[PDB]
Symmetry: D2
Subunit: 436 residues, 4 copies
């Protein structure tokens, strides 16, 4: 009790009963489980991003506005079906729906566009259709590529080459779908930006009863590497026809979040199903409950112990900031980022505090949805003459936007992460600020 | 040998952190141990045939559930007769005979405040037909359990009562319910309609953790392989759900419509068997055993003291099994609560105890039918030899394996106090 | 080569047993000695020439035992210590602040005695930094010492000496109102059974470490060195184990006050302390200290834990902190970082007093204030870095953690920065 | 059942702590030790401690092993010292409460490029006079131990060789020396002159840790209570040194000049006894047992498997003792390696094994001299009851207490494989 007594007196007992905080303070994993409480309500914003596949059930601008409101963060275009003309219209409709909320900069939500490739088929590597589809992706400014049937490091090098010199900023998420991809996982992860556990094909390529082992291992290795991992396929399958999911489906979504997935996905549930918006709402509801049930006490200790020593100041600042956020139960960590990297390094330590990422890059704002707990804020104001004033204005934008979006209140403590000079790669400062 | 240490997720078992444990899980590391989590299959039109019941026993069914929400007493008496005929068709080979428990699942209170009149009549039918277990529907408080116990009468004192937690009140009054029950069922069907669907996993994980702390059986139930009612293969969420219920700590997993009315009852049992075996090997025993030991209170009961010593000894030598003699099942239950990797082979003369111990994870019951030897120590040795010979035939044991043998100092229940390290010859 | 020094193989061990098995007599210490040495001043160590050698040997705090000697005798001891200290001020690098501590005679058969009231008044008038209060039995004893120091002695640190059964039993209430504790083993070993003193020592050190308050281990640590040039095997073991237990300071009494080898006794404590500090099992220690320290909304407390976590992540050579009272350095010290805590301060008294906290290396800044406050902060940080390089704490390519505040005055530390040296 | 008073004694609040920091914070000077002193005391015999009357007082004060320093004195002088020790020990044979075996250890003069001529002759004298242990001076490599072993002739292969590590080479070649030795002595006198004085604590803690990991006895020696050669009370550093050697994990602690030539030999023994008892209660068994368990490799040796099961069982019930039957002392040594809080009462027919087991922390030997029963199980039961009755007489046991009993399945050394939980009647 002494470790939380003064803060319980200051913040109140009501604060410490919410968001599974009694289970979070437990000394063992067994006690953590025993203290999980269905009456302990989640308070934090939902941190695991939702990827929704766009199809006939979710293609209209009106339907896409409801999906964005329900929680969709990434729109997936499955290039296994449909023409380039069909996908270009889907992209235009997503952008029209997203930009319909841009009139209010303090609330606008960026939505990433991901292109999922058809795959190699019977071939040994990059197919001719994939080369044409990847060129379409670059020409239409997609943010992410979900590369199908990645079996080795040379497969991701071929995808990177097909994106050309103009597609250097596109994130490549390698889909692991067969035995070879699982066995060569380390070499694939090393050259990829992240991984997708593509359970549909994986469950037919390897015994169905072994898929959970591959999922848990790949999520663990991605968490260790600090790279995004997506759990995909049949998560809420019965909602293609029914308005409510099965008990196994809610369990599956909760367990993917507890395992450590940065993103969760919907395929037929949103592409062709009867209830696309309800499927997004269900993933949102479960993910929020599961995030609060994470046992941060052991998780943070293990992430620190396993993460190798680092001389990179962004990495050093990130661990200091996450430690500081846990010490004061900070509502948020506000970070300035150009590429998203400083926010990704905070996310890898799995803070309970929201990572509010302020950026001028529209593409980085879309791409950071791949990292658990990163909430992108697109800053549109022109630069101040004095760089230090421009930094301060962006920090104040994060604080004000946070206070006007549900994140912060007067008296809260916030951790602020910034750098010593302009340009990417120089994050080195952590500050503790009291919200006024 | 190096081959031994590559199987049953042993590289992941030796990891220093849970994160490293996850990183070392290997799809090529094959399970070797017998499947420890019992399978409960609900009986119905798809699984009432005596021939179909034989295939379900072979597939891995350990407990047959009779759902009294449907069907008359005459229907349920025929289901019981059919199950017993199928089970006893294998009695001619005592070394491979598999006991199968019969569980009666009550209709419930309905709109009433407590034990309904139909439940009183159904519980009396259960006692008259010798059922082993009662799955009591909609248990909301300790007095509900007392009412079930009273309705079983003086002849049903040995029947196990597993309380079904199906609503908010049952979750909130969980501790008082568990204290007077033999175990719990996380009845997710009704629970998922009584409380928000997105909160069921919290109730499941909490109840399994509390049952594991108490050393009492816990069952995970409903929609685990739902799509297999009409499809030959389950969804990715369904295999994940079964694996995660085992990893959470469930002693039993259940099939309802999948075996009672579906077109793939045998395949649904085979699928639960396959997933449970993989998940049991992926349990992180290093932290689990440390936490169970630390949370279990100090005890002056010799059965409890012997049980923790035997589990510790089994881990030290990678014992293939812990062979235990038991009259009521209690000595096997106390070994099971520490979650040994070694199979707990329980030798008993009680047909009812042999059926009931399927409620405890990792207990493999063997029904001993031979009349007693005149010298008690020789009778004890003959039962231990029966455990060994049954284990060899079934694949649990081989020549050269080490086993831990748990027995007592006098006949009768309650006197377990001896642990012995034995080499299989 | 880096990973073979300072017991780093033993530091990376997964269990305390493996940590012990990996301790290596060939693994040389590299870090600066963190546990301060308190030397009692007497006839063997009173001359200016002897005091210069004691400062060079490692003495950080000079103890004046008011159980013997007149006020005139102690005033001369103080003047000699200050003269020896300022003789190195010509070349600040060898300049090291030395605290002056007054150890009271005690209550005797009486609370606060009349002689103690007069001696505490003398302490305030002569600007002593610390009071070692004898025979503290309860919180009201500390309040009486505080009252006797008056309004001019508010800044003096009170270290309560626990010397009997009552002091041990009422430890929590005494620690709550004290700045720190001294395990006064001489009287403790006669007041309670001799075989129980180690229990009282280990308990008091553990509770002081939990509270983040300084604790001193004292008496008969190197006793045989009063007449012999080398200590016994039990004496070297005792010094090493006091450091391993968690003592912030170790002390010499007769060994330096009247013995034949005062300088050698200081050199021996320095040598043992450096070896013992490298043998600390930081892997479990940091985890336990980090878990036990309560959650806090105080920005200095929040910044301190963030800075120590950052230092461990990059094997930082030092944490440079700006401090007025020493508090920001004390909050970093409580987490027992392997990185040296280099404390830059303008307060000469704070520079002397921070020797009470393990691993705090004070640097006295004496330059005029810059017109722009941000530039004055930058100049002090640069002074910490350049002094760190000159003194051997830092080298090109090292990473340092820098801890500062958002406005002038004590209590506003809230910033941690990661900096690469040259 | 036990009472709140029981849980306030022997540092039990500090023993139940979840962290080492909380363990330290809970150490209490008012919590009195209750268990018998487990760390043996080795006293060096000389002019101050040679008379039969003085030796009787030293045995009463707690001396378990008598050390003969062959660096000084003739064979005739040492033979008379041995005769005086045996006469003093046998003067207590009339009382089963006061009788205690005392081991005799020969400490060699030392090396020269091989074993010295004087050491060959002194080792021969040791075999001829039936010494139990050799403390071999200046052991630098495994071949030095082989030379000592060869010098123990055809008759002294059962004598224990404790290698003294006294220089840099001995520390660097520690692993190869420990592998071939029965145990180690941290000989701090010479070690503190051969290596820098400020590094001796590192060598001590490393060697104690490695011996504890190997399950072999380790002795801490020299200048532990040095000032007591001329003063009636020790310094604060000296009491701290003795307490810290016990906390480090030393099986034995030693007195040299303090008992051989000092003015207070009996008081020095009394002081080591008093400090050792306090320090043993302050051991943090919770983390120590977990680490010893985790570091000890997996084993298929039934004696090793039984030992860890017995120690686990003893902790579960706060057992008053673990009674073990042993012929060579090995089964008692394997229980001792896991550092149980319970006393290990070792019943043996070997007078030599009874003296030698004083090298292992917490082993209390009982020499059994009854003629063997014709029925082996009756002979085993008689010895188990002999251990219980001796435990009652000595104050370890009372009616209602639980004890753990360790035996084997057949006669002869090497077959330990049984652990039983017994209630004292
Ligand atoms: O800290 S964690 O949340 N949990 C660590 C943890 C510790 C012990 C065990 S046990 O020994 O098998 C076990 C199981 C049930 C018992 O009743 C019990 O006593 C012990 C299982 C997990 C975490 C840590 C990680 O490093 C990580 O990568 C991910 C996660 C995690 C992964 C999966 C989740 O379902 C939730 C979180
Ligand atoms: O992390 S620590 O450095 N050491 C933690 C530690 C862990 C276990 C044990 S044990 O279970 O008794 C033990 C003893 C010997 C064995 O062979 C073995 O396997 C286990 C002893 C220490 C530390 C932690 C603290 O929180 C603290 O306040 C202080 C210290 C400490 C204090 C005194 C020291 O001698 C060194 C450090
Ligand atoms: O996360 P990234 O991509 O490294 O960006 C972090 C960068 O953002 C900043 O905080 C502000 O930089 P800009 O003013 O160029 O936007 C830098 O100081 C820091 O290097
Ligand atoms: O697990 P339970 O019901 O306590 O049964 C254990 C009992 O079984 C035995 O091993 C054998 O007893 P029986 O010969 O009566 O079958 C007893 O020694 C022991 O008390
Ligand atoms: O450790 P303390 O006593 O709180 O002092 C820390 C203070 O030192 C500073 O870094 C510098 O303050 P000054 O300019 O007044 O010396 C402040 O920003 C901070 O509040
Ligand atoms: O410790 P040791 O020397 O192996 O002796 C243990 C032996 O003692 C016994 O318990 C009793 O044997 P004995 O009857 O020959 O004395 C054996 O069963 C066991 O093998
Ligand atoms: O491609 C996919 O998403 C799959 O197979 O799951
Ligand atoms: O009753 C049940 O089995 C349920 O509701 O899950
Ligand atoms: O007063 C003291 O310093 C003592 O008793 O140790
Ligand atoms: O020989 C010894 O005992 C020593 O040197 O300490
Ligand atoms: K595709
Ligand atoms: K029912
Ligand atoms: K004094
Ligand atoms: K000698
Ligand atoms: Mg696919
Ligand atoms: Mg129901
Ligand atoms: Mg005193
Ligand atoms: Mg010597």
């Amino acid at each position: 009790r002494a470790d939380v007594a003064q803060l319980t007196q200051e913040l109140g007992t009501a604060f410490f009963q919410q968001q599974q905080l009694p289970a979070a303070m437990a000394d063992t994993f067994l006690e953590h489980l025993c203290l999980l409480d269905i009456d302990s309500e989640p308070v934090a914003a939902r941190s695991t991003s939702i990827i929704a596949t766009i199809g006939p059930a979710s293609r209209s601008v009106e339907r896409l506005k409801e999906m964005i409101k329900a929680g969709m963060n990434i729109a997936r275009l499955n290039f296994s079906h449909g023409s380039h003309e069909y996908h270009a219209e889907s992209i235009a409709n997503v952008r029209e729906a997203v930009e319909s909320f841009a009139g209010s900069p303090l609330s606008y939500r960026p939505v990433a566009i991901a292109l999922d490739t058809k795959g190699p088929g019977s071939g040994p590597g990059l197919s001719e259709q994939d080369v044409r589809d990847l060129r379409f992706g670059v020409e239409h400014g997609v943010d992410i590529v979900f590369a199908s049937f990645v079996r080795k490091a040379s497969d991701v090098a071929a995808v990177r080459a097909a994106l050309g010199p103009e597609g250097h900023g596109i994130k490549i998420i390698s889909k692991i779908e067969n035995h070879e991809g699982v066995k060569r996982f380390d070499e694939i992860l090393e050259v990829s930006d992240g991984i997708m556990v593509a359970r549909g094909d994986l469950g037919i390529e390897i015994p169905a009863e072994k898929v959970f082992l591959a999922q848990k291992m790949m999520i663990g290795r991605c968490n260790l590497a600090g790279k995004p991992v997506v759990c995909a396929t049949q998560m809420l399958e019965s909602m293609i026809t029914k308005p409510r999911p099965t008990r196994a489906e809610t369990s599956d979504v909760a367990n993917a979040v507890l395992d450590g997935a940065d993103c969760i996905m919907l395929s037929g549930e949103t592409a062709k199903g009867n209830f696309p918006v309800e499927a997004v709402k269900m993933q949102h509801a479960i993910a929020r409950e599961a995030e609060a049930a994470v046992y941060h006490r052991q998780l943070f200790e293990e992430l620190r112990r396993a993460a190798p020593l680092s001389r990179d100041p962004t990495e050093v600042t990130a661990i200091g900031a996450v430690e500081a956020a846990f010490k004061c139960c900070a509502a948020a960590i506000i970070v300035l980022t150009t590429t998203g990297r400083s926010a990704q390094l905070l996310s890898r330590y799995r803070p309970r505090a929201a990572v509010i990422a302020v950026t001028r890059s529209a593409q980085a704002a879309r791409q950071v949805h791949l990292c658990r707990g990163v909430f992108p804020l697109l800053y549109r104001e022109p630069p101040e003459a004095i760089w230090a004033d421009d930094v301060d204005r962006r920090v104040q934008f994060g604080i004000e936007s946070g206070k006007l979006r549900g994140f912060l209140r007067v008296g809260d403590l916030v951790i602020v992460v910034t750098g010593w000079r302009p340009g990417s790669g120089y994050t080195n400062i952590m500050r503790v600020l009291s919200i006024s």
